[PDB]
Design a protein around this nucleic acid. Structure first.
Lengths: 122, 200, 131, 180, 32
RNA sequence: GGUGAUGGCCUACCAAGGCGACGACGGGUAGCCGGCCUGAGAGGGUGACCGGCCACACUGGGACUGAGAUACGGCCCAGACUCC
RNA sequence: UGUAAACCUCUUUCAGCACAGACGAAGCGCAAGUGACGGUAUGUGCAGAAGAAGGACCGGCCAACUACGUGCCAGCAGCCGCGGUAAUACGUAGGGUCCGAGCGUUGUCCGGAAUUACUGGGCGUAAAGAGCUCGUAGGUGGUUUGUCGCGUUGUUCGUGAAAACUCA
RNA sequence: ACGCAUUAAGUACCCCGCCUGGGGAGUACGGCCGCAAGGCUAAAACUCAAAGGAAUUGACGGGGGCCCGCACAAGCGGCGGAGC
């Protein structure tokens, strides 16, 4: 490419695909869930993972995974959602952060408590 | 946040005399624990880590404050490793340790912590003060009746005084004349790997 | 057509070094003459001469090859091509290979090597890096 | 007392009608720590065996380097089959900046302060071969002055000559403290 | 060069063209 | 004619001219800069604090006084909105 | 576990109790007054470890490992991927590494990314040479004499607010 | 790497076209041309963690060349037919 071409046309950059659209410049968002249920991932990973179908306040419906093994979560629950990529599931992008406004911390989890929202043993 | 753990611990881990009178180190140089006999993986990273680990645990400072001193060191016009080491040796407490008034590096840290010195007409409870050339370090007034320090000043036959120190005081008055330089220091691991890590 | 005479010159030198030829003949020019003079001074070529042809004059260059057929010149490449005219303030007289290589600046005083150009302080257009 | 390396261990396998007859390789780079540099590429079923093949190979196939106290003279571009490297001299107090391969090379050679950068074909094999091409391409000022008939004065700068006599006096006094 | 690439190309082109045959009519008589 | 002043800034009149591929005319976004972050370096992102300019004062216009007015805690009018 | 423990001792920072107590003011005023900060900062004396440490990770990338419970499960995961009772990759045990009054996760931006390649890339088969020519605007241009100093290049004044960055 | 190697895929400059992971798609919408067929310019959501180029070993081939085994051909007696 001659410099004349560079001058006359330009160097059109890429754009990196901005992930995590629903949060909209937010680290977290607030959610009121529609359905809370379970669904199975792809053929190798034979299991049954726990998911909700949330209506955030960006006015976008999203499937979002629930870490840990316990939930007080059913319809209408008022929760808080954060970002994180799960390999297993097709288009799942968002996780619920436990210990915020409905999600009770899993019990007897005492290693790795900061992430799962667990108070320290006395 | 000063360190608190056993001096024996890091000693058994990495394998260096830093305390001096560590018979548990002599007895068990291998690392401690359940896999204290177990074997470790080699690399560039492990070595470059172990370097600064030994240094900053010898002298008490933390990783981030060491990095601050590093930023100054490579901000200098000299060369990073050895001028870092000169900076790092310019500390007050390490100077008095090499003068030998104190038994442990912890002990020099504690002495300067508790305000037991009196420098040019100001109390200095600063365990990291930087001492340039021609700094008249007198000691305070109540320094006399510290009993283990009485024994210290009286029979201070431990590790010798280096070249760049001296005492010209009946009151144990220690003075700087020149600054430390690495050809005469002769201390454990040199800081080239440290430079390469912090400028990774 | 042709457009780039200096690059033709340098490429042909590179080619004759590549072939281990001993001499080259080119069409003649005043700029090329200054170039061969400078290269003789710096010690790459042995000696040139200006001969003639049917209608135009001609330069004849005699290269330099080490005793065991060690070429005297590693490589070479032009810098200031037509299109991008590559000028220099004297603050940034580009060195080559720790300074071991040679530049060829054209300046008020004529065609100045990098060192003398720096000593004189002035500078201007570049033609080539050499080593 | 020759330093030896391991910067490549791959598990290759020919295939026979029966199955996979596995195999191992090794790329060893030897150097005394003083400028003497050599490269073997051994291979066998046993990793000791392959590495020892490469060891004797590199013991044969040494190669001399333009070193200075701890840095080379000048920069160079080493292009290989597929790998590219940009060796550039540092100032004393820098470190042996490279990845794994070229770092091992230059630590075998003992260059304590120099730069490089991998620009393509990250595989250590061709990384090393481009590195070695660059090192063969390094040319000494003594040689340059010799070939083009001009002195080291006309042919080389002042800071290098400073460092030359500096490291020379350091090496003389080093020997005088060592043996004498 | 392999041929899987050109096969997939061919497939796309055929299938779109067949669709345009089956909608030859409505596109004409809708795009007014 | 008009202003502190040049000026289609306005007025009646004469010619029909002007701009544009170097992007007019349009749309989308957005306050600008000294700077801040990163980077070997170029360059990219970006405009917290502080400092300097621009614009705004519920919405949309206008004028007054006056050395000097987007006249935020002045006026007038029309809306919208709350109270008596 | 681990020199850790008590327990023989020492100094007691930093907190706490009580008295002393500020520059900021060559100021202002022609009045006896003039400190919100502020009775603090700073001191000086008394008692004594008495009032004080947690967080993430451990297969490699990336320094640090074993046992126990479930065993295609529940579950973890930044990537490879881990799990069908004997898991150093799941939850917990002890243990160890890292950091430290912070520790991890999240969100964006830069770098890495020579991954828009002016510095610094490519087009036979990996993505890439218009189906081939003529040609407008434009870009580029042989040899030599003379000339202008527009570019370019050299110095000096003017300028680049201050704050910034870096050296002392 | 295959391979090009004076008819260069190397050596250097001039000009131009063109590319920036695969798929979606050279598709949709809008437009220009076209009697029609349809051509040109030309995306996005969304999704995969690869798609791909060259060469090696093995196997395979209703590709080939050379060969052996009651493998077939020839000659015999059986199974499958009934009883146990």
């Amino acid at each position: 490419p001659t410099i004349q071409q560079l001058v006359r046309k330009g160097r059109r950059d890429k754009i990196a695909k901005v992930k995590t659209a629903a949060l909209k410049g937010s680290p977290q968002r607030r959610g009121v869930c529609t359905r809370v249920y379970t669904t199975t991932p792809k053929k190798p990973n034979s299991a049954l993972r726990k998911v909700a179908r949330v209506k955030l306040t960006s006015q976008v419906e999203v499937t979002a995974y629930i870490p840990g093994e316990g939930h007080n979560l059913q319809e209408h629950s008022m929760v808080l959602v954060r970002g994180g990529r799960v390999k297993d599931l097709p288009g799942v992008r968002y996780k619920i952060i436990r210990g915020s406004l409905d999600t009770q911390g899993v019990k007897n989890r005492k290693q790795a408590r900061s992430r799962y929202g667990a108070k320290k043993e006395k | 946040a000063r360190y608190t753990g056993p001096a024996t611990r890091k000693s058994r881990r990495l394998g260096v005399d830093l305390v001096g009178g560590d018979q548990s180190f002599e007895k068990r140089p291998y690392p401690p624990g359940q896999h204290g006999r177990a074997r470790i993986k080699e690399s560039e990273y492990r070595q470059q880590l172990q370097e600064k680990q030994k240094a900053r645990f010898s002298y008490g400072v933390m990783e981030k404050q060491f990095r601050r001193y590093y930023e100054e060191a490579n901000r200098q016009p000299g060369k990073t490793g050895d001028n870092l080491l000169r900076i790092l040796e310019s500390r007050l407490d390490n100077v008095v340790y090499r003068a030998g008034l104190a038994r442990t590096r912890r002990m020099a840290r504690q002495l300067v912590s508790h305000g037991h010195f009196l420098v040019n007409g100001v109390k200095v409870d600063i365990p990291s003060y930087r001492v340039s050339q021609y700094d008249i370090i007198d000691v305070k007034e109540k320094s006399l009746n510290t009993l283990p320090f009485q024994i210290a000043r009286e029979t201070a036959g431990e590790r010798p005084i280096p070249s760049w120190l001296q005492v010209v005081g009946e009151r144990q008055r220690i003075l700087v004349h020149q600054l430390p330089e690495r050809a005469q220091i002769d201390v454990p691991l040199t800081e080239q790997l440290i430079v390469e890590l912090y400028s990774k | 057509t042709m457009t780039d005479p200096i690059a033709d010159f340098l490429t042909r030198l590179r080619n004759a070094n590549s072939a281990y030829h001993d001499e080259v003949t080119l069409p003649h020019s005043k700029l090329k003459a200054n170039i061969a003079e400078i290269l003789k001074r710096e010690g790459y070529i042995s000696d040139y001469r200006t001969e003639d042809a049917r209608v135009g004059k001609s330069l004849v260059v005699q290269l330099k090859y080490g005793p065991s057929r060690e070429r005297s010149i590693a490589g070479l490449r032009r810098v200031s091509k037509p299109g991008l005219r590559v000028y220099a303030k004297s603050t940034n007289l580009p060195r080559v290979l720790g300074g071991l290589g040679v530049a060829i600046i054209s300046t008020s005083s004529g065609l100045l090597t990098d060192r003398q150009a720096a000593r004189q302080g002035v500078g201007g257009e570049v033609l080539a890096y050499v080593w | 007392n020759y330093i030896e390396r391991v910067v490549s261990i791959n598990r290759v396998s020919k295939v026979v009608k029966g199955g996979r007859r596995f195999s191992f390789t090794a790329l060893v780079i030897v150097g005394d720590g003083k400028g003497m540099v050599g490269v073997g590429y051994g291979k066998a079923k046993e990793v000791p065996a392959a590495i020892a093949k490469g060891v004797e190979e590199a013991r044969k196939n040494f190669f001399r380097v333009p070193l200075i106290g701890s840095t080379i003279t000048h920069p160079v571009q080493g292009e290989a089959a597929a790998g590219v490297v940009m060796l550039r001299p540092a100032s004393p107090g820098t470190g042996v900046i490279a990845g794994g391969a070229a770092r091992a090379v230059l630590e075998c050679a003992g260059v304590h302060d120099i730069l490089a950068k991998s620009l393509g074909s990250d595989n250590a094999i061709n990384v090393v071969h481009a590195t070695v091409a660059a090192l063969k391409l390094l040319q000494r000022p003594e040689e340059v002055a010799a070939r083009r008939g001009l002195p080291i004065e006309d042919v080389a700068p002042a800071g290098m000559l400073k460092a030359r006599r500096e490291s020379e006096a350091l090496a003389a006094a080093a020997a005088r403290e060592g043996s004498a | 060069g392999s041929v899987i690439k050109k096969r997939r190309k061919r497939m796309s082109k055929k299938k779109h063209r067949k669709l345009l045959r089956r909608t030859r009519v409505q596109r004409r008589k809708l795009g007014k």
